[PDB]
Design a protein around this ligand. Structure first.
Ligand SMILES: [Zn+2]
Length: 258
């Protein structure tokens, strides 16, 4: 018995086991485009994924993760509001049961069908485990997905989902290029936040891209065929694995554009 997205263990219940859920810098948040402040000090994002090495895709019960080799600076994120080098460790998605919901962050209260999270950790802290204990330990790149035309670079992920339908299943997933998931523009908003799943640590510097990337209804449909449960257990479709927007409180959202 643990946390999930059901009516008995959903986000509204998380605070009982993880008190930080009611913290001062929780994520996600609603991005108000008119209150967001343009900051000329912000440098362009530097995404170096040319040497990225994917290893495995895994169903972790609350979503599926596509893991990368982070033993060296193969795939890194620099620039933007960041100071230092952050290594890509995984990426995953959150999606809904309907096309009108699924994203965690919202833009002027607008919800997207899904949201992609590329997680990177600050190399100065050695390893992911130590990084999550620091205020500038992680740097998550968030990308919105809207339903429209299909995304060629996502199909490879879509095709292997059948092999990791239930919790605990994993499959080799090599030579996947994450560059195929990026929109044309790298304009972004940024704010200090947390991990949107337990244990909800406030160690994150969020970089949410303004431009969404389109996926077809067929591609999103296959996401909805995954199961929260493990094999041999009652089937529960993996849908609506998103946390609602949290209070912004004493925080300012900055934009790299105007
Ligand atoms: Zn996420």
């Amino acid at each position: 018995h643990h946390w999930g997205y059901g009516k008995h263990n959903g986000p509204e219940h998380w605070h009982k086991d993880f008190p930080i859920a009611k913290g001062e810098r929780q994520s996600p948040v609603d991005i108000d485009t008119h209150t967001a402040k343009y900051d000329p000090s912000l440098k362009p994002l530097s995404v170096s994924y040319d040497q990225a090495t994917s290893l495995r895709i895994l169903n972790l019960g609350h979503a599926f993760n596509v893991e990368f080799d982070d033993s060296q600076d193969k795939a890194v994120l620099k620039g933007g509001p960041l100071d230092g080098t952050y290594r890509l460790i995984q990426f995953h998605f959150h999606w809904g049961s309907l096309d009108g919901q699924g994203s965690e962050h919202t833009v002027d209260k607008k919800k997207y069908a899904a949201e992609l999270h590329l997680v990177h950790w600050n190399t100065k802290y050695g390893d992911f485990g130590k990084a999550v204990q620091q205020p500038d330990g992680l740097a998550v790149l968030g990308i919105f997905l809207k339903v429209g035309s299909a995304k060629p670079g996502l199909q490879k992920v879509v095709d292997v989902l059948d092999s990791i339908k239930t919790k605990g299943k994993s499959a080799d997933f090599t030579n996947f290029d994450p560059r195929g998931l990026l929109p044309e523009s790298l304009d972004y908003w940024t704010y200090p936040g947390s991990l949107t799943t337990p244990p909800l640590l406030e160690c994150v510097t969020w970089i949410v891209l303004k431009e969404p990337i389109s996926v077809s209804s067929e591609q999103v449909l296959k996401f909805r065929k995954l199961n929260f449960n493990g094999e041999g257990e009652p089937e529960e479709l993996m849908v609506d694995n998103w946390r609602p927007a949290q209070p912004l409180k004493n925080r300012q959202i900055k934009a790299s554009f105007k």
